UniProtKB/Swiss-Prot annotation:
Entry-linked Gene3D superfamilies: 3.30.70.330
Pfam families cross-referenced by the UniProt entry: Ribosomal_S24e
Single GO cellular component term: ribosome
Keywords of the record: Ribonucleoprotein, Ribosomal protein
Species in which this protein is naturally found: Thermoplasma acidophilum (strain ATCC 25905 / DSM 1728 / JCM 9062 / NBRC 15155 / AMRC-C165)
Family as reported in the entry's similarity comment: Belongs to the eukaryotic ribosomal protein eS24 family.
Name of this chain's protein: Small ribosomal subunit protein eS24
UniProt cross-references to HAMAP family, sorted A to Z: Ribosomal_eS24
GO biological process, one term: translation
Taxonomic path: Archaea, Methanobacteriati, Thermoplasmatota, Thermoplasmata, Thermoplasmatales
Length: 98
């Protein structure tokens, strides 16, 4: 697989990003999970935890797929501290919750 990415990231409260991606796949074996997903996010400007990619706009007519990928950077931070772990239980109040 060959992923050429044109990443664009916007990080607010949840550090969400938007990137342009094309994976070139060699007709022979089924696409790999890590190869596409890792190279997609990693290239994406993010780690493997941050890889969320839905929909894919195919422009070319050869054998590679293009589209937009979504990435979450909170996946690792949440995994390290665990979402089911008592982080504080109270919430924030910096002049506005959002």
């Amino acid at each position: 697989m060959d992923l050429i990415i044109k990443e664009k990231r916007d990080n607010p409260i949840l550090k969400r990003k938007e990137i342009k991606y094309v994976l070139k796949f060699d007709s022979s074996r089924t696409p790999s999970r890590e190869e596409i997903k890792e190279l997609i996010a990693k290239h994406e400007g993010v780690d493997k935890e941050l890889v969320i990619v839905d929909n894919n706009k195919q422009l070319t007519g050869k054998h590679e797929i293009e589209g937009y990928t979504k990435i979450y950077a909170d996946k690792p931070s949440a995994m390290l501290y665990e979402p089911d772990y008592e982080l504080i239980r109270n919430g924030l109040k910096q002049k506005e919750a959002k």
